[PDB]
Design an enzyme around this catalytic site. Structure first.
Site, PDB file in Angstrom:
ATOM      1  N   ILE A  21       0.866  -1.180   0.000  1.00 43.06           N
ATOM      2  CA  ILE A  21       0.000   0.000   0.000  1.00 43.06           C
ATOM      3  C   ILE A  21       0.907   1.237   0.000  1.00 43.06           C
ATOM      4  O   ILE A  21       0.887   2.016  -0.953  1.00 43.06           O
ATOM      5  CB  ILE A  21      -0.977  -0.002   1.222  1.00 43.06           C
ATOM      6  N   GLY A  22       1.669   1.427   1.089  1.00 39.44           N
ATOM      7  CA  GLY A  22       2.536   2.588   1.260  1.00 39.44           C
ATOM      8  C   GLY A  22       3.653   2.323   2.256  1.00 39.44           C
ATOM      9  O   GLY A  22       3.772   1.218   2.782  1.00 39.44           O
ATOM     10  N   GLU A  23       4.464   3.351   2.519  1.00 34.99           N
ATOM     11  CA  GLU A  23       5.628   3.257   3.394  1.00 34.99           C
ATOM     12  C   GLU A  23       5.870   4.575   4.109  1.00 34.99           C
ATOM     13  O   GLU A  23       5.330   5.611   3.717  1.00 34.99           O
ATOM     14  CB  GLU A  23       6.858   2.901   2.532  1.00 34.99           C
ATOM     15  N   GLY A  24       6.692   4.538   5.152  1.00 28.19           N
ATOM     16  CA  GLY A  24       7.062   5.743   5.893  1.00 28.19           C
ATOM     17  C   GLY A  24       8.164   5.439   6.889  1.00 28.19           C
ATOM     18  O   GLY A  24       8.715   4.343   6.868  1.00 28.19           O
ATOM     19  N   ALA A  25       8.476   6.403   7.767  1.00 29.42           N
ATOM     20  CA  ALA A  25       9.492   6.235   8.814  1.00 29.42           C
ATOM     21  C   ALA A  25       9.064   5.076   9.734  1.00 29.42           C
ATOM     22  O   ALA A  25       9.863   4.201  10.035  1.00 29.42           O
ATOM     23  CB  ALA A  25       9.633   7.523   9.620  1.00 29.42           C
ATOM     24  N   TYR A  26       7.766   5.049  10.093  1.00 27.22           N
ATOM     25  CA  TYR A  26       7.119   3.997  10.888  1.00 27.22           C
ATOM     26  C   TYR A  26       7.420   2.569  10.431  1.00 27.22           C
ATOM     27  O   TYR A  26       7.442   1.666  11.261  1.00 27.22           O
ATOM     28  CB  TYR A  26       5.594   4.199  10.872  1.00 27.22           C
ATOM     29  N   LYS A  44       0.698  -3.474   9.063  1.00 31.74           N
ATOM     30  CA  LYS A  44       1.898  -2.667   9.028  1.00 31.74           C
ATOM     31  C   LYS A  44       2.909  -3.279   9.985  1.00 31.74           C
ATOM     32  O   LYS A  44       2.543  -3.658  11.097  1.00 31.74           O
ATOM     33  CB  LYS A  44       1.611  -1.203   9.374  1.00 31.74           C
ATOM     34  N   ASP A 139      -2.015  15.215  14.873  1.00 36.00           N
ATOM     35  CA  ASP A 139      -1.402  15.156  13.549  1.00 36.00           C
ATOM     36  C   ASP A 139      -2.479  14.912  12.505  1.00 36.00           C
ATOM     37  O   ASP A 139      -2.296  14.155  11.571  1.00 36.00           O
ATOM     38  CB  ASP A 139      -0.301  14.107  13.510  1.00 36.00           C
TER      39      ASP A 139
HETATM   40  O1  LIG Z   1      -2.267   3.583  10.328  1.00 28.50           O
HETATM   41  C1  LIG Z   1      -1.739   3.984   9.292  1.00 28.50           C
HETATM   42  N1  LIG Z   1      -2.223   3.731   8.060  1.00 28.50           N
HETATM   43  C2  LIG Z   1      -3.276   2.874   7.687  1.00 28.50           C
HETATM   44  C3  LIG Z   1      -3.947   2.022   8.570  1.00 28.50           C
HETATM   45  C4  LIG Z   1      -4.992   1.229   8.126  1.00 28.50           C
HETATM   46  C5  LIG Z   1      -5.357   1.304   6.795  1.00 28.50           C
HETATM   47  N2  LIG Z   1      -6.331   0.676   6.086  1.00 28.50           N
HETATM   48  N3  LIG Z   1      -6.347   1.081   4.773  1.00 28.50           N
HETATM   49  C6  LIG Z   1      -5.387   1.962   4.630  1.00 28.50           C
HETATM   50  C7  LIG Z   1      -5.190   2.580   3.293  1.00 28.50           C
HETATM   51  C8  LIG Z   1      -4.502   3.777   3.149  1.00 28.50           C
HETATM   52  C9  LIG Z   1      -4.263   4.264   1.877  1.00 28.50           C
HETATM   53  N4  LIG Z   1      -4.687   3.660   0.761  1.00 28.50           N
HETATM   54  C10 LIG Z   1      -5.374   2.522   0.909  1.00 28.50           C
HETATM   55  C11 LIG Z   1      -5.639   1.942   2.134  1.00 28.50           C
HETATM   56  C12 LIG Z   1      -4.697   2.144   5.891  1.00 28.50           C
HETATM   57  C13 LIG Z   1      -3.631   2.912   6.342  1.00 28.50           C
HETATM   58  C14 LIG Z   1      -0.507   4.830   9.308  1.00 28.50           C
HETATM   59  C15 LIG Z   1       0.717   3.903   9.101  1.00 28.50           C
HETATM   60  C16 LIG Z   1       1.639   4.097  10.294  1.00 28.50           C
HETATM   61  N5  LIG Z   1       0.689   4.436  11.385  1.00 28.50           N
HETATM   62  C17 LIG Z   1       1.374   4.962  12.603  1.00 28.50           C
HETATM   63  C18 LIG Z   1       2.131   3.861  13.338  1.00 28.50           C
HETATM   64  O2  LIG Z   1       1.762   2.709  13.171  1.00 28.50           O
HETATM   65  N6  LIG Z   1       3.138   4.169  14.173  1.00 28.50           N
HETATM   66  C19 LIG Z   1       3.615   5.509  14.470  1.00 28.50           C
HETATM   67  C20 LIG Z   1       5.087   5.651  14.152  1.00 28.50           C
HETATM   68  N7  LIG Z   1       5.892   4.607  14.792  1.00 28.50           N
HETATM   69  C21 LIG Z   1       7.286   4.669  14.582  1.00 28.50           C
HETATM   70  C22 LIG Z   1       7.881   5.777  13.957  1.00 28.50           C
HETATM   71  C23 LIG Z   1       9.156   5.689  13.430  1.00 28.50           C
HETATM   72  C24 LIG Z   1       9.899   4.515  13.528  1.00 28.50           C
HETATM   73  C25 LIG Z   1      11.193   4.352  12.809  1.00 28.50           C
HETATM   74  N8  LIG Z   1      11.759   3.140  12.833  1.00 28.50           N
HETATM   75  C26 LIG Z   1      12.902   3.011  12.143  1.00 28.50           C
HETATM   76  C27 LIG Z   1      13.487   4.041  11.441  1.00 28.50           C
HETATM   77  C28 LIG Z   1      12.818   5.241  11.491  1.00 28.50           C
HETATM   78  N9  LIG Z   1      11.672   5.429  12.165  1.00 28.50           N
HETATM   79  C29 LIG Z   1       9.350   3.460  14.251  1.00 28.50           C
HETATM   80  C30 LIG Z   1       8.079   3.541  14.785  1.00 28.50           C
HETATM   81  C31 LIG Z   1       5.325   3.265  14.619  1.00 28.50           C
HETATM   82  C32 LIG Z   1       3.882   3.211  14.979  1.00 28.50           C
HETATM   83  C33 LIG Z   1      -0.218   5.424  10.730  1.00 28.50           C
END
Ligand SMILES: O=C(Nc1ccc2n[nH]c(-c3ccncc3)c2c1)[C@@H]1CCN(CC(=O)N2CCN(c3ccc(-c4ncccn4)cc3)CC2)C1
Length: 347
Positions: A21-26, A44, A139
């Site tokens: 689907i996609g990617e990010g820092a998370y 994810k 956010d």
């Molecule tokens: O929940 C999230 N996205 C979702 C969810 C459900 C979906 N259902 N359908 C879709 C969809 C979207 C677009 N097109 C079609 C379908 C979904 C998208 C986003 C993805 C990431 N989430 C935040 C998250 O899980 N975290 C916050 C950041 N965190 C974090 C941040 C940085 C790093 C990191 N690690 C290593 C290097 C650098 N940074 C590690 C953890 C991990 C937990 C928000």
């Protein structure tokens, strides 16, 4: 374990047939087929344990979403991780699969007013529930608003969410901030840590403006340029709002600027509904103390066709005190993540 774009997705027997689907820092987010509910889901993979900040954000994401249950808030359906703390290196979070997000939709489609109105209604309905739990999203932006073809909208991404703390909102002028630049309220750059509900209403105002024109209203190129953009449209703050600004340096800065008149909303958005622009004005109010609150926004004439307080639920169990993750080492946060995810283990 199947691989997607060169990444090991170890989701086990319950989840198969992956797709990016996609990617990010998370990390990375993928769609997968669930073999217990018989439906495709989003998964994810997160790998945060080498840094305290990534652990704090992961624990915020998990702890909050597990405590919320609302139609306009993405849930967490399952969490996969190793059976022991020693073996836990990644965490997989399973959520409902949606079709797109508002960021992607606005790149390809101009939205009619009745779509804007219904999406705005759902954002505020979900935000009422979040704010009723004494939580701040911090956010909100188009890419955190998930959509499907039936036009259901769900708010996602609580990794910067916090328990509201208006007594400790004060900070100095030009204090660093983490949330997305273009959606930052003016006070973030002047005197605020973003610990009150008003921070989220400003972001919603930005999103409404963006749905009205398919362009971000305040696309700051860097930190102070964000406040240049805001003041460029709102014009110079009133004497009363300057008297509310708290900081000597913020007051001096605003008093040093040339007088700027307000750019009328009907010139920025000449084809928008007049009630949408009246609500926009109230959300994009400079002084956070005068800015409309979520319940008042739901009651605004623009949303009158949808407004029904009996069908806009609140949280049963609000967060009573601060999470207090700021001064915990990454090892303690890993233990808490392990404990918070225990309910999803076989046994
Ligand atoms: O929940 C999230 N996205 C979702 C969810 C459900 C979906 N259902 N359908 C879709 C969809 C979207 C677009 N097109 C079609 C379908 C979904 C998208 C986003 C993805 C990431 N989430 C935040 C998250 O899980 N975290 C916050 C950041 N965190 C974090 C941040 C940085 C790093 C990191 N690690 C290593 C290097 C650098 N940074 C590690 C953890 C991990 C937990 C928000």
């Amino acid at each position: 374990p199947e691989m997607v774009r060169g990444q090991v997705f170890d989701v086990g027997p319950r989840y198969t047939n992956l797709s990016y689907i996609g990617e990010g820092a998370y990390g990375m987010v993928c769609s997968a087929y669930d073999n217990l509910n018989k439906v495709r889901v989003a998964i994810k993979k997160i790998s945060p344990f080498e840094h305290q900040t990534y652990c704090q954000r992961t624990l915020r994401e998990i702890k909050i979403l597990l405590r919320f249950r609302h139609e306009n808030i993405i849930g967490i359906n399952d969490i996969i991780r190793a059976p022991t703390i020693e073996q836990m290196k990644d965490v997989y979070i399973v959520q409902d699969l949606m079709e797109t997000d508002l960021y992607k939709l606005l790149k390809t489609q101009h939205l009619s007013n009745d779509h804007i109105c219904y999406f705005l209604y759902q954002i505020l309905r979900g935000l009422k529930y979040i704010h009723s739990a004494n939580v701040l999203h911090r956010d909100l932006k188009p890419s955190n608003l998930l959509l499907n073809t039936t036009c259901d909208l769900k708010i996602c991404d609580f990794d910067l969410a916090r328990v509201a703390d208006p007594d400790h909102d004060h900070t100095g002028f030009l204090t660093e901030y983490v949330a997305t630049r273009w959606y930052r309220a003016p006070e973030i750059m002047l005197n605020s840590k973003g610990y009150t509900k008003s921070i989220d209403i400003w972001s919603v105002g930005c999103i409404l403006a963006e749905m009205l024109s398919n362009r971000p209203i305040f696309p700051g190129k860097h930190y102070l340029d964000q406040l240049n953009h805001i003041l460029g449209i709102l014009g110079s703050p009133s004497q009363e709002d300057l008297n509310c600004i708290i900081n000597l340096k913020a007051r001096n800065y605003l008093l040093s600027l040339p007088h700027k008149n307000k750019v009328p909303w009907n010139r920025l958005f000449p084809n928008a509904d007049s009630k949408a622009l009246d609500l926009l004005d109230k959300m994009l109010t400079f002084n956070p103390h005068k800015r409309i609150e979520v319940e008042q926004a739901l009651a605004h004439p623009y949303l009158e066709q949808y407004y029904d307080p009996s069908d806009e639920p609140i949280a049963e169990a609000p967060f009573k005190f601060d999470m207090e993750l700021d001064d915990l080492p990454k090892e303690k946060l890993k233990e808490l993540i392990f404990e918070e995810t225990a309910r999803f283990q076989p046994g």
